[model samples]
Every structure is written in structure tokens, then in C-alpha cells.
Target: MTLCAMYNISMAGSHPTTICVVMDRFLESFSELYDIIDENDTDVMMDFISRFARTDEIMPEDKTVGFVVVNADKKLMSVSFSDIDENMKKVIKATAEKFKNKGFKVETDM
Candidate 1:
């Protein structure tokens, strides 16, 4: 079976995050969408966030999406995920490294 996995990165600001992960990538903000729609419904939200990644012309084979969960100060808050493969882990790590190289602070918390 294909591991069609998606993710979300909720930032600190934006009172209402509009979710629109229409693409094969990921999605958004909320006017309390998390409390209303996001409860126990992450895949749907993850897909929306993936829409932004739109990193490709077509849906990639890996089927993974990314969310930029950061703070209002433009700092990475946390990168949350579950049941992802090694490749995805490496990608997330690389993402952190990339930000670090650029002098950004991404806090990979416990």
C-alpha cells in the first residue's frame, strides 16, 4: 500500500487559518477550525496544508506533505508527526538544517 501521508504546521499568529490543501501536497489557518474540524481529523487538515507545498507540478510518488509550525517571531515551534517513514524523517531533519543554516531557530521539542 502507498503511504499517502500528509502533515500540518500551525504557526503562532493568524487568528483564523484557512485550510485549502487541495493539491496533492498539503494546507491553512482557522477561525477555530482546529477545535471544530481538526479534532481527530488530521489527515484531512494535513492534505490541506500539503496544498501549499505544491512543490511539484503533479502529485509526487512519496505522498508526503509539510506544514510550517512556527511562532509569531518566525521561529519554529514544533514539527509533529506520527507513523512516518525514514525518508520523511530525513526530509524533516534536512528542513531543520536548512533553516538553521539560514540563521533561523527551529525548536524540535520533546
Candidate 2:
């Protein structure tokens, strides 16, 4: 799939991992991923995506999925997602906003 919508989140230490876990928990409440990643199992999710997705993996034709990459050296977690409808975009922004409100630096596309 032609995955679009990249979200670059600054780690600010290991805090981004916590953010990912929190985000995943929210996503899991009403969403799914292309890969069978355990909700909030960020380490495993990172491993799976790095080994398999490479950059940004595609999503299902009927659902929305977000593929994430952990840039350890850069202290960034880039989320490349499939914004098929407006729903995924809203979700991404909402999640990012939640963290941003708590003082996290989440950069999304224009």
C-alpha cells in the first residue's frame, strides 16, 4: 500500500516509549495493525517493524493501521501510517495532542 502520513515524535529520553505504549493502548481500544502486535508491547512492535516493515508497512484494505519505526540514535519514533480515510488522521492527531498536552514534542504532517 502507498502509505502516507508520517509522524515524527521526539523521544526526550525513554519517555517516547511510554508515549507509544499509551498511544497503542488507545489505538487497540478500537483499531488493529497489519501485523499481530501485542498492544503496548513496544519493544516487540519495534522489532517486528524494523525487521519486516522496513520503513512504513501497508495497512489492510478495510482497516487503518499505523507502522512505527524507532530511531534509537536520533531519539525519534517515526510513525508512518495509512490514512485511507479521515479517521486514522484524526486518531493520530488526537493521540499526538494528548501527549503534546503533557509536554511531548509530536510533529505531524501538514
Candidate 3:
């Protein structure tokens, strides 16, 4: 068989153009990128974050990577990861550490 291209991976649930657009807008505004950790599921989100973090290597170094945690009822629990300030870093990590001890899995890198 000949070579065939697949569709966009990270944003399979949404439009590819939209992901690019959102990244474009956020590229300038936010210092980093974040994803979810609820029952919402984000295999694609992990894939996206991996690639987005690497973009800085070959690209403009535009995005950092991180994750936010919410409970199944959609309540915000922790905001632990890169691309945040020092004060929020302490606060967020402390909060995240609490939840993680309770069995949370919200870890990411920049």
C-alpha cells in the first residue's frame, strides 16, 4: 500500500484548525499549556502536551506543559505544574500534594 496520512491526533474530538487557533491565541497570552485530569479522559491531551512542549525546541519555544485536576463532579482540586508564578506555585503544589496523597495523579513538566 502507498503512504496514507492520518487525521490530527490530540484533537480528535474537535477540529484540528480549532486546536491550532486556540494554541495560537494562547501562544502569546499564556506562558504554558495545561490539560485535564478528570474522568474526561485525555490520551490525546497527553500526546498534545508532549508535542507542544517539544515545539519550543524546533519552534519559537511558545508553550509550556502542565495539568489541572478536577473531581468527577467537575470540582477544581489542584493546579500543580509548570508555567505558573512562585506564590501560586507554592499554593498550587501544596494543594496538589494534599490531593495527591489522597490518590490524585496530577503531575506535568514544562
Maximum-TM-score candidate: 1
lDDT of each: 0.41, 0.41, 0.35
Q: Compared with the true structure, what per-residue lDDT tens digits does model 3 show for residues 1-110?
A: 11111112222333321122222233221223333322234655555545543332213434323434344333224332445456435534554454455454544333
| Per-model TM against the reference | 0.41, 0.37, 0.28
TM-score of 2: 0.37
lDDT of 1 by residue, 6-99 (tens): 3333443444233323212221222232333323334654464443344432155534233435342454435555456675466556555554
Task: List, residue by residue over 25-72, the lDDT tens digit for candidate 2.
Answer: 435522333223223466665654344333433356423255444333
RMSD, every candidate, angstroms: 10.9, 8.6, 12.7
Clashing pairs in 3: none
**All candidates in order of TM-score, best leading:** 1, 2, 3
Q: lDDT: which is higher, 2 or 3?
A: 2
Model 3 has an lDDT value of 0.35
Two-way TM-score contest, 2 vs 3, winner: 2
